[PDB]
Amino acid sequence: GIFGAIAGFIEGGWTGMIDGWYGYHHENSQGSGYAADRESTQKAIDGITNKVNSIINKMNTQFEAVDHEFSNLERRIGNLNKRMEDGFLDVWTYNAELLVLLENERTLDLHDANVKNLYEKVKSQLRDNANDLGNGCFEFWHKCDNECMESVKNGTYDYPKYQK
């Protein structure tokens, strides 16, 4: 991605985490496990559901062709009608396909950005108390149990305590 996260410095994804889009794999004395960041995940979900619903909403009109017949001496107006129907058809096809391609790219960039922002959200809390491997993993210097990992997860990590 353009934020470098997805398929970048975080080279791969976890088929283990099945309860969200973005999350965590911790590792300590009580054992490891996967758990998703429901906050940023739900933000992305609402945003994207909104994007899709907005698109479907803006696409809710229909140009309508007709079964109208034109005689032998009505060549011109018949061809006029055909040209019109075709024309509108062309513009709606274009609008559709283009909008799809564009929005797809931007959506992927969005996910990438969310991952990067989460990584930064973490790195801003733990500064000296851990070791940045550079691949989205941080190796503690001190110890961290369950109510320790949980504090980081709900964004309330007390840095001064573990700085010593």
Partner: protein, 325 residues
């Protein structure tokens, strides 16, 4: 002790396209375009269409004797005319403004057949010899249209001026038909209507009409060298029609009480079967049962259909890039 940050992945092999990249596998996507149709004609608004069968709109509406299956009242959500229906205008001629007539019947919902001019409206002529081998019924080799009547001079005397009147005192418009007979020579014209110049004239509040015969020799069609100029009109509520002719009149007999839809209305030329099913969207290609936004089946439809489009697929990515390992 340590902790890692990452993203979702799964068994999905669903692919999308972007501007930068084609064939890209993602975790969760959605298809906006429908390409599936049930090749049949169903009911719309719980109302069933009208199968014209072996009859064309002309033969139906003019009362062709082989279209007696359609005779009487009709009600439709839409109309289905069959690609090779054989029964239309049996006696050779042209239905003036046919295309507009089709557009008008298309914008319809229901008709009620009624007698607008009994054969007694035409005094001192022969209202019971108006037949031809060109317009047979399924039971005899020489009849004529069910909604028209072919007036011929009495078995001796000449053709008197005949008059007719219909005051539309009702609340519904009246679709009706008449015609001018164009013989092949002078002796036929005399045999049927007698000598002297002939005219056919029809007046309403907002429409007049005057025409004479155009006698000439035409190529044989259905064994007839003659022609008939067929005409159609709508008598509005309050309007009243005066018919006056001294010869060559194919007089209106039965007419229809018409119901305008104000909605779209569609006339489909198709051979698909009409089944006892329901639908909310009905294209000429079949039925669409979808909640999707687009469709690539057909631009011609009646009911509530997705926007027609030429694309094969419109995949939209909702999830992120899939990288399992």
């Amino acid at each position: 002790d340590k902790i890692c940050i990452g993203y979702h992945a799964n068994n999905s092999t669903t692919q999308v396209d972007t501007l930068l990249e084609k064939n890209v596998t993602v975790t969760h996507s959605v298809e906006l375009l429908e390409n599936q149709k049930e090749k049949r004609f169903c009911k719309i608004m719980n109302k069933a269409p009208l199968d014209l069968k072996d009859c064309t709109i002309e033969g139906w509406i003019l009362g062709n004797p082989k279209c007696d299956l359609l005779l009487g009242d009709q009600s439709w959500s839409y109309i289905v005319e069959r690609p090779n229906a054989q029964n239309g205008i049996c006696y050779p001629g042209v239905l003036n403004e046919l295309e507009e007539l089709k557009a008008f019947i298309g914008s319809g919902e229901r008709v009620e057949r009624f007698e607008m001019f009994p054969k007694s409206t035409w005094a001192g002529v022969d209202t019971s010899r108006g037949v031809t081998n060109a317009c047979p019924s399924y039971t005899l080799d020489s009849s004529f249209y069910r909604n028209l009547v072919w007036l011929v001079k009495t078995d001796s005397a000449t053709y008197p001026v005949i008059k007719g009147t219909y005051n539309n005192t009702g609340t519904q418009p009246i679709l009706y038909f008449w015609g001018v007979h164009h013989p092949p020579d002078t002796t036929v014209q005399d045999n049927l209507y007698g000598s002297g110049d002939k005219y056919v004239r029809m007046g309403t509040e907002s429409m007049n009409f005057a025409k004479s015969p155009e006698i000439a020799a035409r190529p044989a069609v259905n064994g007839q060298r003659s022609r008939i100029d067929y005409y159609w009109s709508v008598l509005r509520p309050g309007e009243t029609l005066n018919v006056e002719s001294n010869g060559n009149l194919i007089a209106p007999w039965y007419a229809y009480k018409f119901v305008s839809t104000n909605k779209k209305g569609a006339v489909f030329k198709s051979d698909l079967p009409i089944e006892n099913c329901d639908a909310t969207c009905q294209t000429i290609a079949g039925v669409l049962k979808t909640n999707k936004t687009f469709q690539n089946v057909s631009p011609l439809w009646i009911g509530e259909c997705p926007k027609y489009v030429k694309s094969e697929s419109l995949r939209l990515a909702t999830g992120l890039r899939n990288v399992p390992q």
